[PDB]
Amino acid sequence: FPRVKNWEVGSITYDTLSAQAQQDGPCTPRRCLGSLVFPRPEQLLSQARDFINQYYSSIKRSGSQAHEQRLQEVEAEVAATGTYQLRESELVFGAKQAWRNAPRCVGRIQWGKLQVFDARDCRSAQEMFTYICNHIKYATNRGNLRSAITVFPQRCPGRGDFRIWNSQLVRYAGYRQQDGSVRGDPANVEITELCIQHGWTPGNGRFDVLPLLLQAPDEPPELFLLPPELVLEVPLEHPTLEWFAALGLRWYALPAVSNMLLEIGGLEFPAAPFSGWYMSTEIGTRNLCDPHRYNILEDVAVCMDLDTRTTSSLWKDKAAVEINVAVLHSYQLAKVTIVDHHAATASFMKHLENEQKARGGCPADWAWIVPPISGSLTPVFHQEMVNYFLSPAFRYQPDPW
Amino acid sequence: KFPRVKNWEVGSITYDTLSAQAQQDGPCTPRRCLGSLVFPAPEQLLSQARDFINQYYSSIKRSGSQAHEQRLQEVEAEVAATGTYQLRESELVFGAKQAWRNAPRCVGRIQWGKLQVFDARDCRSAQEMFTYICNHIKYATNRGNLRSAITVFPQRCPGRGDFRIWNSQLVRYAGYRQQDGSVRGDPANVEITELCIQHGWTPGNGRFDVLPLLLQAPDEPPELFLLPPELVLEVPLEHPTLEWFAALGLRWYALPAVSNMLLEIGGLEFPAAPFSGWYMSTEIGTRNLCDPHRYNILEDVAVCMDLDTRTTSSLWKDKAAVEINVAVLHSYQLAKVTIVDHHAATASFMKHLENEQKARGGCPADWAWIVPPISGSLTPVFHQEMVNYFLSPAFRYQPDPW
Ligand code: HEM
Ligand code: HEM
Ligand SMILES: CN(C)CCc1cc(F)c(F)c(CCc2cccc(N)n2)c1
Ligand SMILES: CN(C)CCc1cc(F)c(F)c(CCc2cccc(N)n2)c1
Ligand SMILES: C[C@H](O)[C@H](O)[C@H]1CNc2nc(N)[nH]c(=O)c2N1
Ligand SMILES: C[C@H](O)[C@H](O)[C@H]1CNc2nc(N)[nH]c(=O)c2N1
Ligand SMILES: [Cl-]
Ligand SMILES: [Cl-]
Ligand SMILES: [Gd]
Ligand SMILES: [Gd]
Ligand SMILES: [Zn+2]
């Protein structure tokens, strides 16, 4: 049972929950790989038994009446057909648990308040699109954002797979150039290639909302233009730096992740887009400033008249703070839910305390919980964390092509 | 077989083949990563020594030669006769450099080959120990033009207690527990402060009182030694454009000299081997001055800057901290005292990483320690995956002598 210390306060806890870890991670006694982004059939019954036992424990109803019964149906469902269907409530409780189990999510204090849309009866790219569009419009909610996940049909053998070919529902275009460099978002350069490939007309913009590429089983993808009124965007302005607006920067309101495999009770949902709301540093620091993303940092420094000639002026840090100020100021003026890294990390500590008494600990990935600016000014920095894999879970999956 | 490591900034990919020769085991398992935790007989002595001698003879391009085999047998014979062996001087210099080179939490290792090794293995008493330390401080400080130095005191050996420096660093500020539970000075140094007083140090009552040294010779109690004032180069903190900042009375010292770690070379253990380099500005400005459990000056600075400290979304904390780091860099450069900012340091560590991949097929690095505590993703190390493992020779933590 790992001893885990908070260095700001001196407190000690033990992660007893870690002993239940499922799909082992990438680290061995001889070398730690925690910093790596992507870690280097009849036993479906084991993962179904486990999840069902989880479900009935969470309603103070283990070993009573319906618990026994539900074990036999999945036994019979898999005995007969090889796979099984989740009761609607189980799908809800498992979608919530997988968010609860996400070691890299700093937003998990909200895990109990998640809206699960059941799309298990979906059948093709036009049906998906309307599900995706209901999610987007529900989640966006005129800027009063609400956590949502739409669960598309589970995978079963011998037939294809529902997939969203975009990493998120809202992505900006990346346009390669006559000289390799990129106008727009370089993280998306490739899905821009596929959208252009399958018929989309490339704009000329740094911020062109990409179309969607939705794929029904066995059929090739099909482009879907997103309703421009459904794609809520925030222009970025700064409260005191009047020229910031003139940089023509924008970001979207809705972080909706559409490429992760949701895995509940041994079942695989390669299409289950989830969404919450942004922490400002995701936008201001990673998306706008990462050297391989919009990479705007030096442009804002010039505008601030900072000495970019020596790094000891800390011009990078100064411009990065003002970018984050602009992001928070703009989303607030636009009345769009956003949370700064201090409020977010403080609520994560509160979540750690809740999880400690509730489940005996909490899988947390220190490198992803600690914000990408001002790390040690937030409490999570001083909190030792234990990383491990519990089920239900969100897992990465290979790109469909 | 070998970990594939990606740099996300450039897209680059390497394989850390060096990780496969990891001489000891870390705290992680396939169940669970513990990489964020701060504190994770003749046969094995023989095989560690044999491995180190092989390393040493590789570096001087004498692998498998006559000199090499003679030294193995010499060591095996001395381990059989005495239960221990003695390093030649050149092996010691190589072993201290390697230990620095192998330290995964150290972002300053581009410099590892330029290390000044003082051989104090003939030290006899605490008084001689103090003189060796004063000359280390004098040489490393070098009037503000800092040089990397390690002074190696006699190895652990059977029959004798250890040389130990009780202080975690050669220069530390006292932490005076006051009666509220509040601390005047550095709260990290409350324990060593009480020990110094208990050993007869007359306390001051400032916030930057330099602590005396508690020096332990084999099988003796610790002995108190006052550092001569003109040997502890200090830097008053001022800000280039916030002039009220100098009225905070803040200071820090020039020399970061870690004195409580164990240097291990070929199975031999040196519990006393203080090493020193020069500061990276975020250690002082962010960690030592802004940590809530250290000097915790963040709020007072933000208030003086007239930031709105009632809401977090004004980012007053980030704004105050940036300016504290500016003050640190300005103050040291004004005082002509070596200092590196987290941008210059992380960039040189990237060059270290590339040098080490070519030299050894990888480099042990502890990402959470290499990434600076502010502005993390603005530095290049953030976007570099890293492999953490224990190579030997090594610096290791050890329990406090008390
Ligand atoms: C509601 C407020 C939320 C906040 C503030 C938030 C914030 C974050 C942040 C900053 C990360 C770091 C990962 C990255 O940026 O690459 C993350 C990871 C993650 N979050 Fe959340 N999130 C929220 C909601 C949700 C919801 C509703 C779900 C799913 C139901 C979710 C699932 C995940 C997963 C699976 C990851 C890890 C994926 C990865 O590392 O790429 N989050 N979250
Ligand atoms: C000369 C410039 C140097 C710089 C800029 C530098 C920088 C750093 C920094 C920022 C850390 C993390 C400190 C912390 O917050 O815990 C560190 C750790 C460390 N350094 Fe270096 N260092 C330098 C020289 C040296 C030398 C000369 C040695 C030994 C010969 C050394 C050995 C270590 C070790 C063993 C650690 C790990 C201890 C720990 O992480 O608690 N460093 N270094
Ligand atoms: C470098 N970084 C920009 C990578 C972007 C990225 C890639 C992923 F796969 C991923 F799951 C997330 C999660 C972001 C997220 C999800 C839900 C709410 C929220 N507020 N945020 C973010
Ligand atoms: C409080 N927290 C910052 C940790 C303090 C701490 C504890 C250690 F054991 C340790 F080796 C170092 C390294 C500090 C250092 C050494 C050499 C040069 C440099 N520039 N810095 C720092
Ligand atoms: C608990 C957490 O891992 C701990 O505070 C670590 C994080 N990274 C660090 N990095 C450095 N350079 N120094 C530190 O003391 C720490 N502390
Ligand atoms: C190498 C390092 O692990 C990698 O850059 C990680 C660190 N933390 C991150 N944190 C977030 N939110 N997103 C990322 O892409 C990363 N990348
Ligand atoms: Cl994002
Ligand atoms: Cl320090
Ligand atoms: Gd101007
Ligand atoms: Gd001024
Ligand atoms: Zn690990």
Curated annotation (Swiss-Prot), chain A:
Interaction with NOSIP: annotated span: 31-401
Binding residues annotated for (6R)-L-erythro-5,6,7,8-tetrahydrobiopterin, in chain numbering: 35, 286, 367-368, 381
Binding site residues for Zn(2+): 27, 32
Residues the entry annotates as binding L-arginine: 168, 277-278, 282, 287
Expressed in which tissues: Platelets, placenta, liver and kidney.
Effect of residue 395 to C: Found in a colorectal cancer sample; somatic mutation
Localization (cell): Cell membrane; Membrane, Caveola; Cytoplasm, Cytoskeleton; Golgi apparatus
Residues binding heme b: 105, 396
Homology family: Belongs to the NOS family.
Purpose: Produces nitric oxide (NO) which is implicated in vascular smooth muscle relaxation through a cGMP-mediated signal transduction pathway. NO mediates vascular endothelial growth factor (VEGF)-induced angiogenesis in coronary vessels and promotes blood clotting through the activation of platelets.
Subunit structure and binding partners: Homodimer. Interacts with NOSIP and NOSTRIN. Interacts with HSP90AB1. Forms a complex with ASL, ASS1 and SLC7A1; the complex regulates cell-autonomous L-arginine synthesis and citrulline recycling while channeling extracellular L-arginine to nitric oxide synthesis pathway.
Protein name: Nitric oxide synthase 3
Annotated source species: Homo sapiens
Shown part of the complete sequence: 68 to 480 of 1203
